Design a protein around this ligand. Structure first.
Ligand SMILES: CO[C@H]1CC[C@@H](n2c([C@@H]3CCCC(=O)N3c3ccccc3)nc3cc(-c4c(C)noc4C)ccc32)CC1
Length: 116
């Protein structure tokens, strides 16, 4: 299938990550990995087996760790689904997660079409 290369992926995908970072305050819980010790939620890693956050995804884009666009998309939805799994539907963080998902879905669709 189509072979991609890192700089092509970073230039195409990074604006979609940038759109998530620009959401203030909705992206604030997601700009750094969850620290369950500081936040007093010691069961976090009992529930969330593969943590993900914007800073990790950004580093992976920056350092060429995605061979295909769908791997980037996978990590974004993984970050969203970790937050939806751990938090109550009525919580601020759950709602901010859904806001980021709405933004992502608008940003990623034209990009993935253009990478196809
Ligand atoms: C800059 O560093 C800050 C340090 C930690 C702060 N934080 C908070 C605080 C608690 C206090 C009440 C509040 O309103 N907060 C907040 C809510 C939205 C916007 C800004 C502040 N609750 C958090 C929940 C998760 C999380 C996720 C994601 N998935 O599971 C879990 C669990 C992660 C970070 C959280 C966010 C950023």
């Amino acid at each position: 299938k189509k072979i991609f290369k890192p700089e092509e992926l970073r230039q195409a995908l990074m604006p979609t990550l940038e759109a998530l970072y620009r959401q203030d305050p909705e992206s604030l819980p997601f700009r750094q990995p969850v620290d369950p010790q500081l936040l007093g939620i010691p069961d976090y890693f009992d529930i969330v087996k593969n943590p993900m956050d914007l800073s990790t995804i950004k580093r992976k884009l920056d350092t060429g760790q995605y061979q295909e666009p769908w791997q980037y998309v996978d990590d974004v939805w993984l970050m969203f689904n970790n937050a939806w799994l751990y938090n109550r539907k009525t919580s601020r963080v759950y709602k901010f997660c859904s806001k980021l998902a709405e933004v992502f879905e608008q940003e990623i669709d034209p990009v993935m079409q253009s990478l196809g």
